[PDB]
Amino acid sequence: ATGAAGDFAAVNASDAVVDLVYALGAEYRANASFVMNSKTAGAVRKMK
């Protein structure tokens, strides 16, 4: 889960993306990848 129910976490976003990376397990991170749509990568890129 991220936090707030509408969008990324309000206080510290990009914390919900990094624990996603570390929730998957070590053997599957050798070749893993994110899957988003265009407008979600926009919401990720707006994180400042």
């Binding site: 510290n12 990009s14 993306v17 990094v18 990376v21 070590a26 994180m47 400042k48």
Partner: protein, 48 residues
């Protein structure tokens, strides 16, 4: 840091520096996670 950017693995691209303050990192999935009185990180020379 205080500015809100990452200390370890400077940017949101290219994570896992493979050095925690100059020393290797072993991701042993059997240590406790962050609890109230947990010991989640152990640093030491386990060769001795």
């Amino acid at each position: 840091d205080a500015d809100g950017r990452f200390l370890w693995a400077d940017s949101l691209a290219a994570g896992e520096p493979a050095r925690l303050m100059g020393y290797p990192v072993l991701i042993a999935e059997d240590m406790p996670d962050i609890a109230a009185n947990a010991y989640a990180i152990a640093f030491g020379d386990f060769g001795n």
